[PDB]
């Protein structure tokens, strides 16, 4: 079931995560918070030229095995 994905920063390191296609974008941000200490409200996740909405799943966005997403950091905006 599960699979690994990567989350790249703009100019730093890359994060490796273990996920399932049924995982929501909100879950993935939780997993980053677990591995890096970044709250989800400070995280924009990007894939294929757009930011990803929290309540949608990876399979929803056609995110597959070994895909690389991008993490752009932010302050909490409302």
């Amino acid at each position: 079931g599960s699979m690994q994905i990567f989350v790249k920063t703009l100019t730093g390191k890359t994060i490796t995560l273990e996920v399932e296609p049924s995982d929501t974008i909100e879950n993935v941000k939780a997993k980053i918070q677990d591995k890096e200490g970044i709250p989800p409200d400070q995280q924009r996740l990007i894939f294929a030229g757009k930011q990803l909405e929290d309540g949608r799943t990876l399979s929803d966005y056609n995110i597959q095995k070994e895909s690389t997403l991008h993490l752009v950091l932010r302050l909490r905006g409302g």
């Binding site: 790249k8 703009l10 100019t11 924009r44 990007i46 894939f47 294929a48 030229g49 930011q51 690389t68 997403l69 991008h70 752009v72």
Partner: peptide, 30 residues
Amino acid sequence: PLCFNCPICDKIFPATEKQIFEDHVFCHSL
């Protein structure tokens, strides 16, 4: 070309991973 260069930050990306490069350049806009 073997590699691409980000036109904004000068990071180098292998040309074979084109979605990842394009996403990187997109993320500058954000």
